[PDB]
C-alpha cells in the first residue's frame, strides 16, 4: 500500500513475571474522522499468542487472514497440531517479519507496525516488534505510534530492566497498562475510550478482555481554566 487510509493507533505491551500483557483501542480512523468504532486490533493465534496491529486496517485485515491460514496449514498432516507442534509466538513472528521485509523490499509495504506477544512452550515470555520497513526489536516494554512516546516512559518505570521482570506481578503490570491507555486517551487525538486488552500467562493461559473503557479520569480542574492569558471570568 502506498499510502494508508483507515488507520489504527498505538498498540502497547509489557512483560511481567509469568507472561505478557498487550492492549489496543477499538478505533479505525479515517484521517481525523473517527469512523469505525468496533475494530478489534488484537488478534489471538492459538492459546499462546496475541498479535496486535496498528497502521492501515485493510492491511491488518489481510494479515489476519494470513494468520488464520497459517493455523489451518500447520494442522495439515500434523497429528501434534494441538500439542508439541502447535504454533509458537517465535514462529508467527519470524513469519510476519519475513513478509514485512519482503514487501518493503518490493516497494510495496504492508503499512503497519505489529507487536507479537506470547508465551513459548518452554515457559518463556516472547515480545517482539516488526513494522513496515521490516525493522525488529525486543524490549521488556514495546509500543507503537504515540505509545512509543507516552506509554513506554510509564511502563519503563515498572520494568526498567531485565532483572525487574521476575518482580513484576500481573496485577501491577495490568494496572500500569490500563493507566497508559488513559494517558493516551487524554493526549492522542486519534484514540478511543474503548479498548481491548489481553494477557498471556504461562499458568492461566490466554485471558482476552474485550470492551474495556478508560475510567477514573480527571477533568474537574478544567472548570477553573479561564481564557488564555489575562481574562479572569
Partner 1 sequence: GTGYDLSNSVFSPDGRNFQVEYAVKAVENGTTSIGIKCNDGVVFAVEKLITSKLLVPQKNVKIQVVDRHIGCVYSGLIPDGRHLVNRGREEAASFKKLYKTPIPIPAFADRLGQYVQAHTLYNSVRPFGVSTIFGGVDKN
Interface positions with partner 1 (CB under 8 A): 65, 69, 72, 75-77, 79
Region binding Mg ion by CB under 5 A among candidate stretches 39-47, 151-159, 174-182, 214-222: 214-222
At closest approach, how far in Å is the CB of 69 from partner 1? 7
In angstroms, what is the minimal distance from the CB of 57 to partner 1? 17
The answer to whether residue 136 is catalytic is: no
Q: Least Å distance between CB 42 and partner 1?
A: 21
Question: Angle 218-152-199 (CA atoms, 0-180°, nearest 5)?
Answer: 85
Q: Are the CB atoms for 141 and 157 separated by under 8 Å?
A: no
Question: Which range touches Mg ion (CB under 5 A), out of 53-61, 82-90, 121-129, 206-214?
Answer: 53-61
Cell matching residue 181: 491507555
Question: Among residues 81 and 212, whose Cβ is nearest to partner 1?
Answer: 81
Could you tell me if 20 and 141 are in contact, meaning their C-beta atoms sit under 8 angstroms apart? no
CA-CA distance, 174 to 197, in Å (whole number)? 9
Contact 63, 56 (CB under 8 A): no
* Choice from 19, 44, 46, 55 touching Mg ion (CB under 5 A): 55
Task: Supply 164's cell numbers.
Answer: 525487574
Amino acid at each position: 500500500t502506498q499510502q494508508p487510509i483507515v488507520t489504527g493507533t498505538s498498540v502497547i505491551s509489557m512483560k511481567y513475571d509469568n507472561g505478557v500483557i498487550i492492549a489496543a483501542d477499538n478505533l479505525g480512523s479515517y484521517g481525523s474522522l473517527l469512523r469505525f468504532n468496533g475494530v478489534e486490533r488484537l488478534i489471538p493465534v492459538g492459546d499462546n499468542t496475541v498479535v496486535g496491529i496498528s497502521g492501515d486496517i485493510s492491511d491488518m485485515q489481510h494479515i489476519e487472514r494470513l494468520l488464520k491460514d497459517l493455523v489451518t496449514e500447520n494442522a495439515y498432516d500434523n497429528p501434534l497440531a494441538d500439542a508439541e507442534e502447535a504454533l509458537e509466538p517465535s514462529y508467527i513472528f519470524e513469519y510476519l517479519a519475513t513478509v514485512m521485509y519482503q514487501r518493503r523490499s518490493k516497494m510495496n509495504p504492508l503499512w503497519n507496525a505489529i507487536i507479537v506477544a506470547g508465551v513459548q512452550s518452554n515457559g518463556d515470555q516472547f515480545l517482539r516488534y516488526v513494522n513496515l520497513l521490516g525493522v525488529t526489536y525486543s524490549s521488556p516494554t514495546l509500543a507503537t505510534g504515540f505509545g512509543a512516546h507516552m506509554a513506554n516512559p510509564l511502563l519503563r518505570k515498572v520494568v526498567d530492566r531485565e532483572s525487574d521482570i521476575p518482580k513484576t506481578t500481573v496485577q501491577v503490570a495490568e494496572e500500569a497498562i490500563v493507566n497508559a491507555m488513559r494517558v493516551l486517551y487524554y493526549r492522542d487525538a486519534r484514540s478511543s475510550r474503548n479498548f481491548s486488552l489481553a494477557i498471556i500467562d504461562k499458568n492461566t493461559g490466554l485471558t482476552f478482555k474485550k470492551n474495556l473503557q478508560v475510567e477514573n479520569m480527571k477533568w474537574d480542574f478544567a472548570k477553573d481554566i479561564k481564557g488564555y492569558g489575562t481574562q479572569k471570568i
